Curated annotation (Swiss-Prot), chain A:
Domain of life where this protein originates: Eukaryota
A biological-process GO annotation: antibody-dependent cellular cytotoxicity
Encoding gene (name): IGHG1
Record protein name field: Immunoglobulin heavy constant gamma 1
Region entry CH3, spans: 99-202
Amino acid sequence: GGPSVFLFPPKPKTPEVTCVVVDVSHEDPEVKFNWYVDGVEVHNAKTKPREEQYNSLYRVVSVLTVLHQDWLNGKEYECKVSNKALPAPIEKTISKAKGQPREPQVYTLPPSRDELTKNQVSLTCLVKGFYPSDIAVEWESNGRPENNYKTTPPVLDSDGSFFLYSKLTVDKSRWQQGNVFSCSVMHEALHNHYTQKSLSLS
Amino acid sequence: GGPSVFLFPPKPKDTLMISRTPEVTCVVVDVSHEDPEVKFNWYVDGVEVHNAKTKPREEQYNSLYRVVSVLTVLHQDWLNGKEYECKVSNKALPAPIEKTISKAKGQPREPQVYTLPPSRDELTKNQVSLTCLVKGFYPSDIAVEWESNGRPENNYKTTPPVLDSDGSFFLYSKLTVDKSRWQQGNVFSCSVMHEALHNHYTQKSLSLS
């Protein structure tokens, strides 16, 4: 277990910059935030009460209200979190430049030919090129939501965008019969904030 | 308020590479400012050792100290499941604090490596994604790389291990290449290092159909 930090832009429609700390250890729930604007610190940010994730680890959020005309001018906003279980403080920066939302690309991949020997096969859903990291993925089959899937946490790609993979495990018999499976993704940068990519045998 | 102890295992790549140094790290947090000294005792399967290295103390954001002791472990010792105990003594402690760590116990499971070509929808783009699914391995310590034509490929990212529904772990490694390299039929290789593999190494190729 190790904490991760994410910075969120104000939505284009009161503006706010958000620093999210996920996977805070259960022994030391305390997290200390320091906010920088072009290098000088501000103190008007307010920290939300801690939330316990499904894995007992904690999610601690700090919200900094941002001057509207300031965001138009392109000033950098820095969030520095510091925790006892942390080897060193974690720093994140966000601005209007490349803080822009990026539409995720959703690709479904059938099982490897070598996996068709096993009794179960892996249906994978690749979601790449999205910003910010907040995203939700689900699997269905003919509209019935599936239960035996797992999704990796977001991974920062080499271009500043994020990607992840979701793996649905289905019986090989169900796959070869021609069943249709769907990978659903919800994200703010998507058109209608929702898209679905289907997957089926040849 | 009260000083607590955390014990970390070695990094996965340090346990898998003969040229690296795997370390067990004992971290004492919230050490008193007027009683700052900490005495470390290290035990390997009950036998005390003395080759541990202490680091200079570091003050935190709350005016209290953090002191770290680092013990080098043998590659074969860690893989064989030897247990490492760190005992932390301090004047402000009513009694010493003991913490013990070892490699994840349970039957080691061989990773299954599956290479997945880019989706046809991505073939309209200038760069395509080459996917390496590594599935069903235990424990989670693992290392993944990409190479091609005898040279490593470095434009890849790998997800951390994820706990699967069967008690094993899986991850994905994504190699991004120019579309023309993939359309040429050039062969790419996903290499995995893991204790359960023969010679702790395997590699699966990925090429155009």
